[PDB]
Write a structure and sequence with these properties.
about 650 residues, alpha/beta, Rossmann fold, six-stranded mixed beta sheet, five-stranded parallel beta sheet, about 60% helix, binds adenosine-5'-diphosphate, nucleotide-binding, repeat
Length: about 650
């Protein structure tokens, strides 16, 4: 009986109704069942990244066995999960031997479950090998594919549920969790949990991370409930203060205001208790309801008779009616204490995790979108047609006026260098994705070969991995004309399917991304134009047809033309570049203003037609930041005095007048 010591009986747990409900996973369970009765290589292995509910599938199978929804071959079978802990508490091999003995004793009525299957074979227990082929033991694996790469039984692949699936799962677990945490859970909190966990948490997987959000928020709410209310602390401190003062004076007066405040503090206190009572009641009955439901599920099993109709008709709906009567009573009675876990709570927990202010997490998206041109113009200066096209396309996408199976947007940027293409990329990344850090930059110059379409996909790939870890990002493909012909096909697959199958066979989801492609092909004809504010697109389309096939031009949302930078433009770019410096100096108490002619010097030294505004930054770094740092470290320039940037001879100088 090493099973009593070294295993947990899952069918036993399911029989007691102590297993949480399993929502979805119908096909995976059915498959596993199909494989368990397999004539050879029967036993099956659940393969998927941690937290996707492989164990959930096992428990679901157990529940089906107990409920008798499984084929006659699996009726009455027992599912036991082998625990890795109790074994290692030379004893390992002997204990495991006893386990295999016990499993060979009933010969086929017991199914063993091994989570992290690699740990058994791979601290690499060897003795397990005979029982598989001999048929002494029938087991179900749960292992990662990585570890099934290590190990290479039947392949059973457990995918990761989508947002909708996760939501259904959480809605199924909702009552159990409400009971578990002594709280109410809002459906907005559920959808917010799934959605936000999907978006912001990169490393973890669904449903698990969403469930963690829910859990933590529930803990927070619990602690908030237990704690003494604000008003009561306020009043206690206040009356203690007035007590102090009064006894020190021993004014009357205060004597009255004491008493009154003691009446109030009394009333509130009683109210507090009352509320607590209500809560407690609502929980107890809840528990009882559960115990009733489990009970009727026992009654279906062993066949009590008037029992089940008494529970179904008498007990369950009475408890159900006074439960929501208690919740509507809660609706009336609850003031000082809030038991409802909302989307706001989920937001606060994921705030704790991520570090986002969370104003962004729920800031109104429609107002963000409608004002988009302005927001993008806060960073990108000039290039009005570009911002217009991009903003319009993204608006179309978010309004749901476009194919849902394609990326949010697809743009081809055309024009010279240094005109702010990459600037608009970073601006987009910031605007929608809350950082420039959510961007994926790939130079196409380094993919010209067959080893190119190899490298970025697989044979992992530079692209697929980045998009998999960061589904919301701006994918910028620079100098796309240099690309290897095999890559363009992959690009079409992304622009169309909104997904891409890699060298490993798994599909990466691009539907949350904005795909931007830049090219210098139009640079000459564009610099040679302004021609009308319109016809340019036709003119350059002419040169587009040479290097690009109709498929590509038609599958991208907008083809963007970037104009060279005017004088006032470069001036403004300069000022924006000076903002950061201004800020860093503002922190130390320096105020800097720049002369118009000095700004002209910067604008001149920062712009040449071939590199555009690229030289500008280190034109500032060299001509301004260097002597500035010199004087700051010198002590010549002192905080609390305005620093004017003027010109001396042809060179820029800093002064305190
Ligand atoms: N279909 C489902 N129905 C209900 N809960 C699920 C489902 N899939 C996953 N879960 C939940 O996800 C949580 C973590 O899943 P888990 O089985 O630990 O993942 P894995 O074992 O595959 O790493 C579990 O608490 C489980 O309740
Ligand atoms: N339209 C613009 N708006 C704001 N900054 C710009 C603009 N054009 C150029 N710059 C500045 O010039 C630098 C280089 O420009 P960049 O966007 O990289 O050009 P390209 O997209 O052709 O590589 C950027 O860091 C940016 O600060």
């Amino acid at each position: 009986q090493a099973l009593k010591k070294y295993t947990i009986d899952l069918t036993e747990r399911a029989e007691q109704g102590k297993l949480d409900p399993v929502i979805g996973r119908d096909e995976e369970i059915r498959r596993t069942i199909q494989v368990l009765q397999r004539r050879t290589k029967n036993n099956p292995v659940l393969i998927g990244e941690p937290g996707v509910g492989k164990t959930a599938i096992v428990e679901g199978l157990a529940q089906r066995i107990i409920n008798g929804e499984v084929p006659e071959g699996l009726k009455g079978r027992r599912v036991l999960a082998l625990d890795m802990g109790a074994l290692v508490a030379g004893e390992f091999e002997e204990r495991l031997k006893g386990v295999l003995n016990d499993l060979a004793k009933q010969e086929g009525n017991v199914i063993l479950f091994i989570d992290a299957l690699h740990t058994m074979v791979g601290d690499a227990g060897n003795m397990l090998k005979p029982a598989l082929a001999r048929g002494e033991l029938h087991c179900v694996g749960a292992t990662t594919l990585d570890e099934y790469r290590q190990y290479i039984f039947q392949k059973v692949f457990v995918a990761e549920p989508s947002v909708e699936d996760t939501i259904a799962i959480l809605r199924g677990l909702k009552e159990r969790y409400e009971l578990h945490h002594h709280v109410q859970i809002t459906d907005p909190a559920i959808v917010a949990a799934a959605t936000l966990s999907h978006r912001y948490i990169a490393d973890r997987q669904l449903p698990d991370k969403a469930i963690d959000l829910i859990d933590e928020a529930a803990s927070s709410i619990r602690m908030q409930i237990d704690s003494k209310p604000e008003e009561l602390d306020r009043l206690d401190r206040r009356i203690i203060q007035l007590k102090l003062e009064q006894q020190a004076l021993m004014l009357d007066m205060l004597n009255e205001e004491l008493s009154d405040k003691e009446r109030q503090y009394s009333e509130l206190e009683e109210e507090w208790k009352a509320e607590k009572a209500s809560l407690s009641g609502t929980q107890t009955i809840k528990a009882e309801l559960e115990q009733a439901k489990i009970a009727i599920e026992q009654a279906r099993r062993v066949g009590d008779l008037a029992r089940m109709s008494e529970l179904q008709y008498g007990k369950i709906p009475e408890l159900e009616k006074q439960l929501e009567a208690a919740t509507q009573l809660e609706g009336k009675t609850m003031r000082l204490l809030r038991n409802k876990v909302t989307d706001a709570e989920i937001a606060e927990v994921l705030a704790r995790w991520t570090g986002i202010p969370v104003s962004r997490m729920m800031e109104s998206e429609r107002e963000k979108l409608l004002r988009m041109e302005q927001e993008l113009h806060h960073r990108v200066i000039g290039q009005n047609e570009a911002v217009d096209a991009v903003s319009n396309a993204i608006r179309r996408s978010r309004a749901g006026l476009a194919d849902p199976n394609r990326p949010i947007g697809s743009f081809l940027f055309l024009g010279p260098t240094g005109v702010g293409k990459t600037e608009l990329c970073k601006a987009l990344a910031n605007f929608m994705f809350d950082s420039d850090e959510a961007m994926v930059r790939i130079d196409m110059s380094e993919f010209m070969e067959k080893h190119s379409v190899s490298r970025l996909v697989g044979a992992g790939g530079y692209l697929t991995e980045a998009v998999r870890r960061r589904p919301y990002s701006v994918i910028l493909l620079d100098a796309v004309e240099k690309a290897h012909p095999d890559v363009f096909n992959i690009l079409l697959q992304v622009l169309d399917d909104g997904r891409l199958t890699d060298g490993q066979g798994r599909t990466v989801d691009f539907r949350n991304t904005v795909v931007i492609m830049t090219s210098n092909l139009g640079s000459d004809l564009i610099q040679e134009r302004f021609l009308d504010y319109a016809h340019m697109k036709e003119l350059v389309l002419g040169v587009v047809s040479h290097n690009f096939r109709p498929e590509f031009i038609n599958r991208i949302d907008e083809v963007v033309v970037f104009h060279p930078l005017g004088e006032q433009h470069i001036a403004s770019i300069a000022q924006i570049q000076l903002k950061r410096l201004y800020k860093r100096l503002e922190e130390r108490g320096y105020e800097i203003h720049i002369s118009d002619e000095a700004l002209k010097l910067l604008s001149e030294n920062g712009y040449d037609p071939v590199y555009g505004a690229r030289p500008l930054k280190r034109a500032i770094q060299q001509q301004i930041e260097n002597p500035l740092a010199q004087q700051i470290l010198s002590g010549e320039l002192v905080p609390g005095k305005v620093i004017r940037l003027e010109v001396n001879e042809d060179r820029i100088v800093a002064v305190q007048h």
